[PDB]
UniProtKB/Swiss-Prot annotation:
One Gene Ontology molecular-function label: electron transfer activity
Family from the record: Belongs to the rubredoxin family.
GO cellular component: cytoplasm
Protein name from the UniProt record: Rubredoxin
Residues noted as binding Fe cation in the record, renumbered to the chain: C6, C9, C39, C42
Origin species: Nitratidesulfovibrio vulgaris (strain DSM 19637 / Miyazaki F)
N-formylmethionine carried by residues: M1
Source domain of life: Bacteria
Alphabetical list of SUPFAM superfamilies matching this protein: Rubredoxin-like
Length: 52
């Protein structure tokens, strides 16, 4: 599934992995990630990402 890049720090959210230790089990798409989710390495919200 399509990956999103964190505009602030460049961290790339990967659907094929998700963000396990923050509730987002793997295989999850980006529309599908918990609205409250923030970038794990710099805090930015979902609104600050862009399709990679
Ligand atoms: Fe970030």
């Amino acid at each position: 599934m399509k990956k999103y890049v964190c505009t602030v720090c460049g961290y790339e959210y990967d659907p094929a992995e998700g963000d396990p230790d923050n509730g987002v089990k793997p295989g999850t798409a980006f529309e599908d990630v918990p609205a409250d989710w923030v970038c794990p390495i710099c805090g930015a919200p979902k609104s600050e990402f862009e399709p990679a």
